[PDB]
């Protein structure tokens, strides 16, 4: 199963970073969160997580996107950055 959620972050100036490390994978399409940077906007917000898939930013489709396309969108954004995410899998497993 997967959870779909929306997260809105607000830049205090046009050059502020979100504090996210985005990666591609060779074995599946998409853009994924690897980790959040210490003290950044995303970490402060507390909703985004490692292994989340970024489906869209501000209505711009990223399903088959790249980290560089995400960077372009974010760097050119307005103050509000809305991310639509997919979060797969079980959070706890006994094995």
UniProtKB/Swiss-Prot annotation:
Coiled coil: none annotated. It comes from the Eukaryota. Residues 6-89 form the PDZ domain. Interacts with the phosphotyrosine interaction domain of NUMB. The NPXY motif is required for the interaction with the PID domain of NUMB. It is however not sufficient. This is Ligand of Numb protein X 2. The chain holds residues 336 to 424 of 690 of the full protein.
């Amino acid at each position: 199963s997967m959870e779909i959620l929306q997260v809105a972050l607000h830049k205090r100036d046009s050059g502020e970073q979100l504090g996210i490390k985005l990666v591609r994978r060779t074995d599946e399409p998409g853009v994924f969160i690897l980790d959040l940077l210490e003290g950044g906007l995303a970490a402060q917000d507390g909703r985004l997580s490692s292994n989340d898939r970024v489906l869209a930013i501000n209505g711009h489709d990223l399903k088959y996107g790249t980290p560089e396309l995400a960077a372009q969108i974010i760097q050119a954004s307005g103050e509000r950055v809305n991310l639509t995410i997919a979060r797969p899998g079980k959070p706890e497993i006994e094995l």
